[PDB]
């Protein structure tokens, strides 16, 4: 495991709300018993469209996902976090997460940063009109930076501990 203190990377604007575990990683990918790379399962159904955001340069090298509300809503699988992480995402931003997802994220090294929806809208606009704009998430200070916009995020303190300490 690696310890999470700050992460900067290309932001990916995903205007999808209420994203369920089987959209994050379809069921057909979770018969694998191994632990090697789940990156090819990440959004695999949606990736069939060449215009899906994650297929477009430079978003295909993104590591900060800016999603709509209710990301990972409902029941979800550990593999959803593994798929995100294996693809290279270290941060997911949403104004509300599913709780099971949110807990799994912190336990696996993924920052699930809760940001007010008005601020999610600003982040989408910035990265949409400047593809490749980096987003920074600073866990010590619990802020997201994009250009000259700086905004707070929330995380529970237990998750923060696990992430900062790099716990398995």
CSV table of C-alpha atoms in Angstrom, one decimal:
chain,number,residue,atom,x,y,z
A,1,UNK,CA,0.0,0.0,0.0
A,2,UNK,CA,1.1,3.6,-0.4
A,3,UNK,CA,0.3,6.4,1.9
A,4,UNK,CA,-2.0,9.1,0.6
A,5,UNK,CA,-1.0,12.6,1.5
A,6,UNK,CA,-1.5,14.7,-1.7
A,7,UNK,CA,-2.3,13.7,-5.3
A,8,UNK,CA,-2.2,15.8,-8.5
A,9,UNK,CA,-3.4,14.5,-11.8
A,10,UNK,CA,-5.5,15.0,-14.9
A,11,UNK,CA,-9.2,15.5,-14.0
A,12,UNK,CA,-11.8,13.5,-15.8
A,13,UNK,CA,-15.3,14.9,-16.1
A,14,UNK,CA,-17.9,12.1,-15.7
A,15,UNK,CA,-21.4,13.6,-15.8
A,16,UNK,CA,-23.0,10.4,-14.6
A,17,UNK,CA,-25.0,10.3,-11.5
A,18,UNK,CA,-26.3,7.4,-9.4
A,19,UNK,CA,-23.4,5.3,-10.8
A,20,UNK,CA,-23.8,1.6,-9.7
A,21,UNK,CA,-21.1,-0.9,-9.1
A,22,UNK,CA,-21.9,-2.8,-12.3
A,23,UNK,CA,-21.3,0.3,-14.3
A,24,UNK,CA,-17.9,0.8,-12.5
A,25,UNK,CA,-17.0,-2.8,-13.2
A,26,UNK,CA,-19.4,-5.1,-15.0
A,27,UNK,CA,-20.3,-8.5,-13.4
A,28,UNK,CA,-18.5,-10.5,-16.2
A,29,UNK,CA,-15.2,-9.2,-14.9
A,30,UNK,CA,-15.6,-10.3,-11.3
A,31,UNK,CA,-15.3,-14.1,-11.8
A,32,UNK,CA,-11.4,-13.5,-11.7
A,33,UNK,CA,-10.0,-15.0,-8.4
A,34,UNK,CA,-6.7,-13.2,-8.9
A,35,UNK,CA,-5.6,-9.8,-7.8
A,36,UNK,CA,-3.7,-8.6,-11.0
A,37,UNK,CA,-5.2,-5.7,-12.9
A,38,UNK,CA,-8.8,-4.8,-13.1
A,39,UNK,CA,-8.2,-1.7,-15.2
A,40,UNK,CA,-9.8,-3.2,-18.3
A,41,UNK,CA,-13.1,-3.7,-16.4
A,42,UNK,CA,-13.3,-0.1,-15.3
A,43,UNK,CA,-16.4,1.5,-17.0
A,44,UNK,CA,-16.0,-1.3,-19.6
A,45,UNK,CA,-19.5,-1.2,-20.9
A,46,UNK,CA,-19.4,2.6,-21.3
A,47,UNK,CA,-15.9,2.4,-22.9
A,48,UNK,CA,-17.4,0.7,-25.9
A,49,UNK,CA,-18.3,4.2,-27.2
A,50,UNK,CA,-15.2,6.0,-28.7
A,51,UNK,CA,-16.7,9.3,-27.5
A,52,UNK,CA,-16.9,8.2,-23.8
A,53,UNK,CA,-14.7,10.5,-21.8
A,54,UNK,CA,-12.2,8.0,-20.7
A,55,UNK,CA,-11.4,7.2,-24.3
A,56,UNK,CA,-10.4,10.7,-25.1
A,57,UNK,CA,-7.0,12.1,-24.8
A,58,UNK,CA,-5.8,13.3,-22.3
A,59,UNK,CA,-8.6,12.1,-20.0
A,60,UNK,CA,-7.6,8.5,-20.8
A,61,UNK,CA,-4.6,9.2,-18.5
A,62,UNK,CA,-6.7,10.8,-15.8
A,63,UNK,CA,-6.3,10.1,-12.1
A,64,UNK,CA,-8.9,12.3,-10.5
A,65,UNK,CA,-12.5,11.4,-11.4
A,66,UNK,CA,-15.1,14.1,-11.0
A,67,UNK,CA,-18.4,12.3,-10.9
A,68,UNK,CA,-22.1,13.2,-10.4
A,69,UNK,CA,-24.0,12.7,-7.2
A,70,UNK,CA,-24.5,9.3,-5.7
A,71,UNK,CA,-21.4,7.7,-7.1
A,72,UNK,CA,-21.2,4.1,-6.1
A,73,UNK,CA,-24.8,4.3,-4.7
A,74,UNK,CA,-26.3,1.1,-3.2
A,75,UNK,CA,-24.4,-2.1,-2.7
A,76,UNK,CA,-21.1,-2.3,-4.3
A,77,UNK,CA,-18.2,-4.7,-4.7
A,78,UNK,CA,-14.6,-4.3,-3.5
A,79,UNK,CA,-13.7,-4.8,-7.2
A,80,UNK,CA,-15.2,-1.3,-8.0
A,81,UNK,CA,-12.4,0.3,-6.0
A,82,UNK,CA,-9.8,-2.0,-7.4
A,83,UNK,CA,-10.8,-1.2,-10.9
A,84,UNK,CA,-10.6,2.6,-10.3
A,85,UNK,CA,-7.2,2.2,-8.6
A,86,UNK,CA,-5.8,-0.2,-11.2
A,87,UNK,CA,-6.7,2.2,-14.0
A,88,UNK,CA,-4.7,4.9,-12.1
A,89,UNK,CA,-7.4,6.9,-10.3
A,90,UNK,CA,-6.3,8.0,-6.8
A,91,UNK,CA,-9.2,10.4,-6.2
A,92,UNK,CA,-12.9,10.3,-6.9
A,93,UNK,CA,-14.9,13.5,-6.3
A,94,UNK,CA,-18.7,13.5,-5.8
A,95,UNK,CA,-21.2,15.4,-3.8
A,96,UNK,CA,-22.5,12.1,-2.3
A,97,UNK,CA,-21.1,8.5,-2.3
A,98,UNK,CA,-22.6,5.2,-1.6
A,99,UNK,CA,-21.5,4.4,1.9
A,100,UNK,CA,-20.2,0.9,1.2
A,101,UNK,CA,-18.1,2.3,-1.7
A,102,UNK,CA,-16.9,5.2,0.4
A,103,UNK,CA,-15.6,2.9,3.2
A,104,UNK,CA,-14.0,0.4,0.7
A,105,UNK,CA,-12.2,3.3,-1.0
A,106,UNK,CA,-10.5,4.5,2.2
A,107,UNK,CA,-9.6,1.0,3.0
A,108,UNK,CA,-7.9,0.4,-0.4
A,109,UNK,CA,-6.0,3.7,-0.8
A,110,UNK,CA,-8.5,5.6,-2.9
A,111,UNK,CA,-9.6,9.1,-1.8
A,112,UNK,CA,-13.4,9.5,-2.0
A,113,UNK,CA,-13.6,13.3,-1.5
A,114,UNK,CA,-17.1,14.7,-0.8
A,115,UNK,CA,-17.5,18.1,-2.5
A,116,UNK,CA,-20.5,20.3,-2.6
A,117,UNK,CA,-22.4,19.9,-5.9
A,118,UNK,CA,-21.9,23.6,-6.8
A,119,UNK,CA,-18.2,23.0,-6.6
A,120,UNK,CA,-18.5,19.7,-8.6
A,121,UNK,CA,-20.1,21.9,-11.3
A,122,UNK,CA,-17.2,24.3,-11.3
A,123,UNK,CA,-14.7,21.5,-11.6
A,124,UNK,CA,-16.5,19.9,-14.5
A,125,UNK,CA,-16.6,23.3,-16.3
A,126,UNK,CA,-12.9,23.9,-15.7
A,127,UNK,CA,-11.7,20.5,-16.9
A,128,UNK,CA,-14.2,20.4,-19.9
A,129,UNK,CA,-13.1,23.7,-21.3
A,130,UNK,CA,-9.4,22.9,-20.6
A,131,UNK,CA,-8.9,19.1,-21.1
A,132,UNK,CA,-5.7,18.1,-19.2
A,133,UNK,CA,-6.2,20.5,-16.4
A,134,UNK,CA,-4.8,19.0,-13.3
A,135,UNK,CA,-6.7,18.7,-10.0
A,136,UNK,CA,-4.9,18.4,-6.7
A,137,UNK,CA,-6.4,16.8,-3.6
A,138,UNK,CA,-4.5,17.6,-0.4
A,139,UNK,CA,-5.7,15.2,2.4
A,140,UNK,CA,-3.7,17.0,5.2
A,141,UNK,CA,-5.6,20.2,4.5
A,142,UNK,CA,-8.8,18.6,3.0
A,143,UNK,CA,-8.9,20.9,0.0
A,144,UNK,CA,-9.1,20.4,-3.8
A,145,UNK,CA,-7.3,22.9,-6.1
A,146,UNK,CA,-8.0,23.4,-9.8
A,147,UNK,CA,-6.4,26.4,-11.5
A,148,UNK,CA,-7.1,29.3,-9.1
A,149,UNK,CA,-10.2,27.6,-7.6
A,150,UNK,CA,-9.7,26.2,-4.2
A,151,UNK,CA,-12.5,24.2,-2.4
A,152,UNK,CA,-13.0,22.2,0.7
A,153,UNK,CA,-13.8,18.5,0.8
A,154,UNK,CA,-15.1,16.2,3.5
A,155,UNK,CA,-13.9,12.8,4.6
A,156,UNK,CA,-14.4,11.0,7.9
A,157,UNK,CA,-11.4,10.9,10.2
A,158,UNK,CA,-11.0,7.1,10.2
A,159,UNK,CA,-10.8,7.0,6.4
A,160,UNK,CA,-8.3,9.9,6.6
A,161,UNK,CA,-6.2,7.9,9.1
A,162,UNK,CA,-6.2,4.8,6.9
A,163,UNK,CA,-5.2,6.8,3.8
A,164,UNK,CA,-2.5,8.9,5.5
A,165,UNK,CA,-1.0,5.9,7.2
A,166,UNK,CA,-1.1,3.8,4.0
A,167,UNK,CA,-2.8,1.0,5.8
A,168,UNK,CA,-3.6,-2.2,4.1
